[PDB]
Amino acid sequence: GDTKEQRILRYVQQNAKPGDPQSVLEAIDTYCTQKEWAMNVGDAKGQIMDAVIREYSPSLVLELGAYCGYSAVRMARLLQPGARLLTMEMNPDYAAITQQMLNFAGLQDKVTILNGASQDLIPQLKKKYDVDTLDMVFLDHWKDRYLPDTLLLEKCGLLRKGTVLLADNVIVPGTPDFLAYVRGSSSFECTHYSSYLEYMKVVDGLEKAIYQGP
Ligand SMILES: Nc1ncnc2c1ncn2[C@@H]1O[C@H](Cn2cc(CNC(=O)c3cc([N+](=O)[O-])cc(O)c3O)nn2)[C@@H](O)[C@H]1O
Numbered sequence: 001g002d003t004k005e006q007r008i009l010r011y012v013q014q015n016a017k018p019g020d021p022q023s024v025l026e027a028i029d030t031y032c033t034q035k036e037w038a039m040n041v042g043d044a045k046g047q048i049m050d051a052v053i054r055e056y057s058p059s060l061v062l063e064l065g066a067y068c069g070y071s072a073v074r075m076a077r078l079l080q081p082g083a084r085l086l087t088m089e090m091n092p093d094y095a096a097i098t099q100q101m102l103n104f105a106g107l108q109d110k111v112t113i114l115n116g117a118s119q120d121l122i123p124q125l126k127k128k129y130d131v132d133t134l135d136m137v138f139l140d141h142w143k144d145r146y147l148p149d150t151l152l153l154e155k156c157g158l159l160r161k162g163t164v165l166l167a168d169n170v171i172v173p174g175t176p177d178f179l180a181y182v183r184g185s186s187s188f189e190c191t192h193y194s195s196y197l198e199y200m201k202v203v204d205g206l207e208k209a210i211y212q213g214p
């Protein structure tokens with residue numbers, strides 16, 4: 001009784017300043033550097049994420065896997081007014097942590113949390129949420145869903161030329177099938193950003209894959 005995710009949030013509520021997203025991010029990072037490792041994107045990879053976001057200024061972002069709401073907070077705090085983030089989370093407990101994390105950050109009005117698995121929700125985006133195409137996609141869910149969900153996004157017509165895919169953990173725990181596909185495919189221009197597994201000295205990285213169209 002009493003999960004790590006609940007402890008992380010409790011620490012944020014005690015040490016972070018309400019309505020200040022930088023503060024919420026620093027609290028989580030501190031908690032996870034000092035007390036318990038947890039699978040947030042972390043500040044090192046979060047900084048690359050920030051740079052990618054500022055470059056494209058997406059109006060509509062889709063995130064796969066929210067977890068505690070760390071990357072959701074990172075991204076939604078950089079979004080222009082009227083720009084939105086959709087985040088898919090299959091575990092209702094983590095989704096609740098995320099909602100409260102975003103509420104504390106004062107970012108709740110920029111984000112919609114979708115409850116359910118990506119494979120079930122993605123085919124419903126156009127019909128049930130009036131989504132034309134996506135400006136950007138952050139992949140941070142089950143590693144072996146990266147490729148299937150990409151092909152699924154393409155099938156559902158959610159990708160246009162210019163859609164940026166940003167994938168966490170392509171080295172650790174690794175997504176070798178996703179990497180071979182986007183790199184080998186002329187439908188994706190790919191950039192690797194070398195970095196470190198969150199809160200550790202193990203080499204990890206993000207992959208940016210830009211859809212070129214059919
Ligand atoms: N199909 C899915 N649809 C929606 N949400 C999903 C799905 N699969 C997992 N999630 C969510 O990802 C979050 C966190 N997560 C991520 C994974 C797969 N990713 C990792 O395991 C991971 C693992 C490490 N690691 O092992 O060092 C480091 C990282 O940065 C990671 O993202 N499992 N739970 C959880 O909230 C879970 O509900």
Ligand SMILES: [Mg+2]
Nearest residue numbers: 041140168169
């Ligand atoms: Mg990750």
